[PDB]
Structures are given as C-alpha cells and as structure tokens.
Amino acid sequence: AHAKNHDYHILPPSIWPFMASVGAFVMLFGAVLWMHGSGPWMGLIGLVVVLYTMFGWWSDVVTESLEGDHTPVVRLGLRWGFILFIMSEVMFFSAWFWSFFKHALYPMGPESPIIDGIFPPEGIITFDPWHLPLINTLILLCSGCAATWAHHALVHENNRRDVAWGLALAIALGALFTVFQAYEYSHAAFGFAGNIYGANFFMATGFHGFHVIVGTIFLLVCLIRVQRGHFTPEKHVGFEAAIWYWHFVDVVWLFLFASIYIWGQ
Amino acid sequence: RGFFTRWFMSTNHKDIGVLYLFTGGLVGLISVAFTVYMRMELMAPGVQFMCAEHLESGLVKGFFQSLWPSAVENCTPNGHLWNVMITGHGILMMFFVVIPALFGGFGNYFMPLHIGAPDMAFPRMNNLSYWLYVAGTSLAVASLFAPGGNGQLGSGIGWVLYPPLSTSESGYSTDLAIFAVHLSGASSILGAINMITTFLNMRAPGMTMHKVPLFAWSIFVTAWLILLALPVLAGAITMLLTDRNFGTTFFQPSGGGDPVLYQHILWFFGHPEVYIIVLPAFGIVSHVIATFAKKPIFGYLPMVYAMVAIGVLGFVVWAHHMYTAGLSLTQQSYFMMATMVIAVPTGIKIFSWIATMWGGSIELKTPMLWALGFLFLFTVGGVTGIVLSQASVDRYYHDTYYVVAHFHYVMSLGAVFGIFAGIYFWIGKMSGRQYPEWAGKLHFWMMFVGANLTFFPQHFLGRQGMPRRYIDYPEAFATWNFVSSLGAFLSFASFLFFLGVIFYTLTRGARVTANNYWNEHADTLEWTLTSPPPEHTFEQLPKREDW
Amino acid sequence: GHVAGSMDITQQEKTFAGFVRMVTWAAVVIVAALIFLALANA
Amino acid sequence: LEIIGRPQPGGTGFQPSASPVATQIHWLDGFILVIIAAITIFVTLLILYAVWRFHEKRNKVPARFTHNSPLEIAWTIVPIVILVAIGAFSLPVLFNQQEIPEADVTVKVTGYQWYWGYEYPDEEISFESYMIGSPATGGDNRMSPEVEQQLIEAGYSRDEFLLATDTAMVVPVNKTVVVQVTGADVIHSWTVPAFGVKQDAVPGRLAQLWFRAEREGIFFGQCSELCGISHAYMPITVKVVSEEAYAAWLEQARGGTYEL
C-alpha cells in the first residue's frame, strides 16, 4: 500500500478459493454418485482438485511469510484464528460424545422411555481397556512429550537438530497410533451396521483417527520446513499451531479413552 | 480489474459483501417464488395445481401447465410436490437467503469499516467462504432435480430433515441436500472465525470494545453462536448420511436408535440459528434509529449486554421445539421456564429503541419506516413465542399454522425488515447512486399491508386446528386461506417493485457526491469516506478524534 | 514509507490475554455445570 | 350423530371444549392473550406517540440523554414479574396434562404410514381407521361422486371430506382414557383439538396421554408430523358414546364388524 501506517496484511487477488469450491462441489456430488451404485472417478477428481488448491494456498502462506508480510500483529491474527478452529473442532466432537453418553445412559429397550434397556448392548463385547487401549494412549502421550520437546528446544535453546529429532520421533509415533488403531478394527467383536454401539463406537474413534492422520501430516510439513530452515525462535507459527493441534488430538483421545473404553465396559 | 479478476478472485471485503447481497437476493426471489406456488395452491380447497398427471409430460412441458388451474375431478393429488416445495423454501431461506445477506453482505462490508480496519483479518479465506456458499446453494438446488422420494424428484422431508422419514426416503435427493447444509456450515464457520479475529485484533487505536458500534457487536455475537452451533449440526446430519448410505442405526429403533436424539442435536443448533438471523437485524436497527432520530443510542452497554444475554440463553432452550415428541415433565419445565427468560433481554432492546426515539427529532425517511415496522412486527412475532414457550398451550399450537405465523412475523416481518432497512440506508454509500424516496415509501407500505395479510390470518387457522405441511385442507379453512394467499401475491408484487427500484437506481439513480447523505447523527466511520468508498479503505488509520 | 513491524500492539496483546482467560472461564463453567446436571438428574 | 369438535368456516377461535384439559387450555390462552394484547398495544402507542410528538418539525432540536436508571429498572422488573405470573398459572396446567391417571379404558394408537392402528388391550379388539377417500376405499384422496356418496352412507356430509374415517375409535363419556402412542415406521402425531390433547408417534417409543370426555359426539384430529405424501390424508375420528352402548359396542366389535 502506497503510504500506509499499519502492519496488517493486505493481499493480492487469488484464484485459489474459487477453484477449491468447484473441486468440493464436484467432490461431494461425485461422492453422492458413488454411494448410489455409480462410479468413483467424479469424487476423486473433486478431492484431487481440492488438495491441489490446499497445497498451493498453504505454499503461498509460507511464501507470504518469507516476504516478511507476517508482522507482529499479522502473526497474532493467525494464532487467534487457528485457536477458534480448534474450538470449532471441539464442538464437533461434542455431537459424537453426546450420542455415546445418551445411549450409554438411557439405552433403548421395549418400554423406552418409561424403562431403559441395557448397555453395553446385549451380546456386544467391549474391548479390554488395558491391553491395546493403554498402548495407544501411551503412544500419544509419548509423542505429545516428544513434539513439545522440539517446540521448547527451538524457542528456548534454539537447538535445531533436537527440534527435527523430536519432530521425526513424534511423526513416526503418530502413524503408529493409526496402525495400532487399524489393528483394533481388524479384531473388533461387534459390527458397524445394525447396532447403535457400532455406529457410536466407530464414528467416534473414526473421526478421531481422521484427525490423528491430519495431525501427523501437519507435523511432517514442519519437519520439511525445519529441514530447509524455515523457523526461528521469534517467528514460528506453523510450529505453534501444530503443537497446539497435536495436543487437541490427544485431549480428544484421552476423553474417548476414559469415556468409551474405561467408563463404558 | 478484469471482470474475472475482480469478482472471481476477490480479496476485498467490500466486494465480497456485495457478492453475498445479490447472491442472497437471487436465491431469495427463487425461494420467494416457491411461496407463490404454494399460495396459489392453498388459495382454494382441493388440489387444483399439484396434480400427479403432469409427471408424464417432460419437465419442460408439465411445468408450464402447473401455473394453471385444473378441475378437482381431473386433478390427482400429488402430495410430494407440495412437500418438496415447502422444504425448498425452508432450506433456501434458513441457509441461503437471510444469513448470507445480513451476516456476510452487510457484515463483511461494513463491520470492518465500523471498527476502522483496513480489511478483514483473512482476506483469502473470506473469498473462500463466498464460493463455498455457492457450492451449497448449487447442491441444494441440484437436489430439486435429482432422484428423490416416491419415484419423483426432490426430497419432501422438512428443512430440519427428521428421521426416520429422512433416512428411508428413496433416491439421492436428500444426500445432496445433506451436503448442501454441510458446505453452508463451512461457509458460516470460515466467516465466523474471520469476523472474530478481525474485530478483537483489527480495531483502530483507542477503540475499546466498549467504544464499538452496535452493528459490529451484533456481528460479533452472531459470529460466536455460529462457531459453537454449526459444528453440532455437522454431526447430527452426518448421522443421517451414515444411516442412509452405510446402514448404521443412529435413529433406527431396530438397532437401538432414537429419532428423538436427532431432534435434540438438531435443535441445539436449530435455536441458535434463529438468533443468528435476527442478531444482525438488531444492530442495523440501532444505526437506523440513532441516525434518523438524530440522537445517541439509549443505554448502549445494556444494549450490548442484552445481545450477549440472548446468544448465551440461545444455547440452553432447544427442546421448546420438541414439546410433544416425547419428553419428561421435568424436561418440559426446564425448557419452558428457560425459554421465557429471553424476554427480559429482548424487551430491554425494544424499550431502548422507543427511548432513543423519545426526546429527539424524527425524520421518517424510508430507512426508518422499516425500523419502526420491525419494532412492531417483531414484538407481534415475539409475544406469540411466549405463548408457544408455554408447554401446555403448545400442545394445541404445535405443528399447526399458529407457529407458522410466529416465525414469519419475527422472520418475514422482522429480520427481513432489517435486510431492507439496511438496503435503503446504505445503497448510496456502496453505489454512488441514491434511490427514490417515493418508490421506497410505496414499497414499504405495500409490503407491510401485504405481509400483514399474508400471515395474520394464519393465527386464526392455527387456533382452528389446521395442521402444518398439508397440501390440502378441509372446507372450513377456505376463507382465511384466500386472504393469506391474496396477501402473498400482494407481497410478491412488492418484491418485484423493489428489484426494479434497485435496478433503476443503479442505472439512473441520483449520483451521490456527499460523504454523508443523511445527517450529522450518522456518526460512524463509514460516513467519513467517499460515496462509493476507496478500494483500500483505511491505508491511513482513523485518527482518534476523526470520529 | 515501509516500517514493517513497528506498529504498537499493546491493545491487542492485552485483548488476547483477556480472550484466553475468558474462554477458560467459560469452558470450565460448563463442564462443572454439565457435571452438576449429571449428578442431580441423570 | 353429533359432530362437535370440527373446524368452523371463517373461524378465528378454538374448537368446542369437550374435556377438562381443553377447558383449561382455552382459559390459559385467553389470559395469556390479554396480557400480550396489552403489551403489544402498549408498545405501539409509544412508537406512534413518539413519532408524532417528536417528529423534527414538532421538536426541531434533539435531546442528548442516554440513561435513566429508575426507568430501566422498572422495565426489567415489570416483565419479570409478568412472567412469574404466567408461570403461576402455567406450570399447574402442565402437570395436570402430563401426570397420568388410573385408566377406566385404555387404547393403543400406532401410526402407520397413511393410517392409524387402534387397540383395546383389555377387550381383545383391534382394527384400523382410514380416511374415507383413501386408495384403501377406491379413491385417490379427493372428492368424487363415489367419495361423496360413500361419506353420505357413512353418516357424514360432503364438507367433512378430509376428516371422516372408515373406522372410528369409540369411547365412553365421563371415563378416563389413557392413549399410549407409538409409531410404526416414520414419525407421526396423533391429536384431538377438542380434547386439548396431542402427541407424536415415534418409532421405538411409548408415549402416554390421558383424556376424559364430559360429552358425547364425533371429534376429529389429523396427522401432525410430516410423514410422507399422504401426510394430509390420515384423518382421525373419535366417537364418544354413552356407557350402555359402549358395552354393546364391545360385543358387536368381536364379530369382526368395526363400525357403530
């Protein structure tokens, strides 16, 4: 801006947003198609386009930060936005937990609601909380510590080998969660269709497994940035959001773990 | 400024707001015309228009015949056409007409100006909100033309999509409608986050949160409620989607599901939605009342805190839309009692408005007529709600037309009044061309008259037992349906006037050259700029005394 | 007239500080309410 | 035939009071209506008054006040005491209608797409009720010579088309009937204006309602919850008769004939 007195970030035009909205129209219309006997090709196109848009858009986000556009308030604007994003995330889960706690409390049975049935559902076999469950909660707690440790080092010691070390370690353990989580599905004692327990069980940990993967990918991109030297102790916003996010993922799992595996057995 | 560059890759919050206005305007007419359809068909008993025999004809063929009466004898009652109409209205209106104009048009464009901010915190992401609003619309409309219930097209379910009718309805119509609401909820959450970082981070020096315009405060509270409510609706509608395409059983009794739990998680967002619509309307009213009564808005803090009072109560009263679905008496009292409390907050607002007017000299320009209409009709609408808040009286009133009149008074004679109040009030500022004081007055009078005829009769019908979502009705309900129907054609006429008034204006409208074309009492930062505003408003930040 | 970074951000930092406190206040007030309800009526 | 509880051309009021809950609903609304007739009027009168008393040619110069503590207080307590008042007279009516008595009769209502299912568990009686124009009776849900005639033979008239059913639920005056409503497929809702009672029929749930008729006659209700295409076409008909005929009804209904 020719003669400005302010640090906020004003931006050149940008096509990205339109593109990703067509992608998503096509994605979801094709996704409807594919759930109704027709072919996948239209849905994967959508996602291919959306993913293209997402990578540009975020590439340019760093780009712009390297152009020094990320002034003191600009970096605070970003941090705040992102924090509303995790508050939105938290409310999304509130819907998933709300179902699990209601059916777990007032289970449907023939005189419902005068009289409630039984939970867990007749003939459902809940998993053992201390054999695999605890394994995956120790795997996340662990990674959490490992990822925070890369955060601290960078900001507090400015140590950059350490920083990438904690990242790698955290990244690989986030993928392990997924592998172990997949194992659980393999060995499930109930089904997904036909029974509340399966719907709630699976959609609930199902949405949490989504996020882990988004988590683990996010950190991967920090490792990459960190390898090309993209972070300083004063400027390090992707880093702050990843660590905050990772931690949300873990806080959601922990409550799942105590809600669904520990309390509801 | 290639035309493609400007509107298709927008980064400026004042062009993105213009986009949401026309866009919302568009879909409002489309939606609006489906209402004429219904009113033609409800004008008179028996089914004359929505006949089953028109299905044989291609769509291009049967369509045109449907705008012309058939004899009862040769008319074959196709209830599904009705059910699809009633739900295109509902879904278009509550997701694609009013929140987009009032929140993303007049809020995106102006909230920023009012705080003395360059632009919006996240420009790219805002443009992305605009375009995902299109996707949803598109998907929702596409839905009318795709395979749907009973071998016809279109999902005739309810704008709230309750199962197990929503799950069992055949086709994929209701899948497109399900994902339309998803995109519209992303739309709203992206917009919501943007307006929340911007207002608390991008205010001008010395502008404390108690020194911010009320219009901006209303977009602030609105934006909070969206953030906390749409994600809960992404979940209840993801449970419809799974139960239809992955044979889950959330609201399917054969697998231990509960249709009622759907109603709780939908209304926990279905209540916050109605305050999300009228919040912005309360903010534009302030402005218009301060401005045209030539006097400071009375009780500014209590107006700001009333706002936050409503939105917070708005998340704890949602089973009032379920009094007859099967709830405990305890549940019925908690929710009746709790809903009653929002009356304090709103009244304070209503009195302060009458008070501002009190003691000042009033200029009955077009923009003030709407504000005064709204003062009256929103109260009419409001009262009703208290009657409906009473669990006991709701038995009879539930699912009858006495609710339909509620919601249209405080929606069609309420927040819609705020959509036009803001239109007339800020058309020059955003266009460089003012409108005709005479045509504006005519419009106002037309639609107040029409729209009172449209829904006042329905209070009767509701007391006389007419059920909701019928395509036909008894002989005893003809009288008042005629009246209503007459009323809606009178109101549809008006909306046509208004689009010509607007068209004219942006064509041959008075060139505006002043920076404030109203009066000295219009004291917010938008009136300190040209007339049509610079493309980069506030490179130089608003000096503290400037306003 | 470039001077990236030299703007005054005192007001925003104090604002964020309140924001972070107010949200925590909220969150925990709901949870203990949710809990209350649970105990009284569940 | 005494057709009481039914719509009345050009009617703006309620349906006749055939029971104690309806009596009270009518009284609860009345009272509530005046208190908000008062407020509505009252709110217009200031708007009007102020618009004219303070129009710019009547008072050229504006005032600058923005707060009047006393007044604010008044306007926030007044409505809060108004609301308590309504509470006093409203919770009580709620409790009477949702606190269910000892039955003297018991029916079970089950909404099925495009008809109702009635059962009297104590007397071993089960039948169904369909509108007279249902495709279940020859028509397409619209008036036709056949339709007209079929209703005349029922005991109804051309104008009660969409409300009369082929099978009526019979009932004894002065007796408490508890209706347990459940839905069989999608949701439905079973009411009777004249009784002041109404309740949704939801798949997987047993909801109860009670009612007592002080007088005899034909009372009509109508599906109340978007259930499909023939949402408009699933009337409800209730017949309240004396107790001596009710018993007779029991016996006559055991041979498979389900009409009175």
Ligand code: HEA
């Ligand atoms: C806020 C949105 C909204 C609006 C504006 C309207 C406007 C109108 N609606 Fe309604 N309507 C609903 C939301 C709305 N409606 C909903 C949610 C339902 C229930 C759905 C369901 O049952 O599932 C419903 C139901 C409904 C019904 C009965 C349904 C039934 O049988 O169950 C009827 C009955 O005739 C009706 C009539 C009308 C009429 C005549 C108008 C108007 O045409 C009359 C006056 C208003 C205008 C004349 C024009 C207003 C135009 C705008 C405000 C445009 C905004 C854009 C710009 C300014 C650029 N509507």
Ligand code: HEA
């Ligand atoms: C802008 C939209 C809007 C707004 C603001 C409101 C506001 C209110 N609504 Fe609602 N409502 C709808 C839109 C809205 N509503 C819609 C669309 C539906 C139907 C949904 C569907 O089922 O499809 C609905 C449905 C609905 C129902 C359920 C209907 C049913 O049973 O099917 C109820 C019942 O509790 C209710 C209550 C209220 C109340 C108490 C208010 C209050 O907010 C009003 C408060 C205002 C006042 C109280 C007047 C101002 C106060 C004073 C002037 C003080 C003086 C007066 C007194 C103290 C009494 N509304």
Ligand SMILES: CCCCCCCCCCCCCCCCCC(=O)OC[C@H](COP(=O)(O)OCCN)OC(=O)CCCCCCCCCCCCCCCCC
């Ligand atoms: C199976 C194998 C298939 C593999 C295909 C993989 C395709 C690749 C897709 C991966 C996406 C890459 C993500 C990168 C985003 C991070 C951008 C970033 O860090 O820059 C943003 C800015 C950083 O600035 P700063 O850190 O201060 O720079 C310091 C330099 N001095 O910090 C910011 O501005 C903060 C911005 C935060 C980013 C938002 C993230 C939240 C999104 C979560 C939504 C989930 C969507 C997932 C997709 C599902 C499909 C719908």
Ligand SMILES: CCCCCCCCCCCCCCCCCC(=O)OC[C@H](COP(=O)(O)OCCN)OC(=O)CCCCCCCCCCCCCCCCC
């Ligand atoms: C019951 C609640 C449970 C809900 C789950 C939410 C869990 C939150 C996730 C935790 C992640 C925090 C990770 C901290 C490690 C490294 C990052 C960090 O320490 O940032 C500290 C930051 C201080 O920020 P500051 O120093 O002010 O920066 C510029 C100041 N001018 O302080 C911050 O701003 C940290 C921001 C991250 C917040 C994530 C999202 C918050 C969502 C609201 C959660 C509220 C939880 C309620 C807490 C109750 C406490 C008893």
Ligand SMILES: CCCCCCCCCCCCCCCCCC(=O)OC[C@H](COP(=O)(O)OCCN)OC(=O)CCCCCCCCCCCCCCCCC
């Ligand atoms: C992110 C990591 C951590 C995890 C994040 C998510 C935490 C969420 C934990 C709680 C979320 C909501 C859980 C609510 C449980 C309610 C259980 C329930 O359904 O109660 C029953 C009642 C319906 O029962 P009914 O069938 O009508 O009665 C039959 C009885 N014979 O149902 C009702 O009447 C409704 C009951 C109350 C409604 C509460 C809904 C509020 C949801 C928002 C919660 C916000 C959590 C705040 C997060 C703080 C983080 C900073």
Ligand SMILES: CCCCCCCCCCCCCCCCCC(=O)OC[C@H](COP(=O)(O)OCCN)OC(=O)CCCCCCCCCCCCCCCCC
């Ligand atoms: C009802 C609930 C439904 C849930 C859906 C809600 C949203 C889903 C959409 C996915 C993408 C949203 C991620 C939001 C990130 C928010 C964090 C934040 O504050 O990011 C700030 C950054 C600002 O971007 P910018 O305007 O370019 O600022 C430049 C400053 N350097 O912002 C960014 O980094 C922008 C990156 C966006 C990438 C484009 C992707 C579009 C995809 C839309 C599909 C949505 C479908 C969601 C379905 C939910 C599934 C259950």
Ligand SMILES: CCCCCCCCCCCCCCCCCC(=O)OC[C@H](COP(=O)(O)OCCN)OC(=O)CCCCCCCCCCCCCCCCC
């Ligand atoms: C019991 C059930 C309840 C139901 C749920 C409740 C939902 C509520 C949604 C309503 C949102 C509106 C909140 C408005 C807050 C207004 C407070 C305010 O502005 O106080 C002024 C204070 C003073 O700052 P001052 O310096 O004087 O002025 C600015 C000069 N810079 O300013 C400050 O210190 C700045 C504070 C910023 C405002 C904070 C906004 C966050 C509040 C939202 C809570 C979110 C709850 C999250 C729960 C889900 C968590 C997962």
Ligand SMILES: CCCCCCCCCCCCCCCCCC(=O)OC[C@H](COP(=O)(O)OCCN)OC(=O)CCCCCCCCCCCCCCCCC
């Ligand atoms: C890593 C280590 C982690 C370990 C974690 C350990 C801690 C575990 C945390 C557990 C928290 C779970 C809370 C679950 C809540 C259960 C309460 C509940 O469901 O009660 C419902 C209540 C009674 O339901 P009802 O059907 O009457 O049952 C009666 C049977 N005689 O329903 C009623 O009485 C009806 C009254 C309804 C009143 C609604 C009140 C509103 C509720 C809160 C507001 C929600 C709004 C949120 C806003 C957020 C936005 C800011």
Ligand SMILES: [Ca+2]
């Ligand atoms: Ca007709």
Ligand SMILES: [Cu+2]
């Ligand atoms: Cu509500």
Ligand SMILES: [Cu+2]
């Ligand atoms: Cu039905």
Ligand SMILES: [Cu+2]
């Ligand atoms: Cu129905």
Ligand SMILES: [Mg+2]
């Ligand atoms: Mg209903």
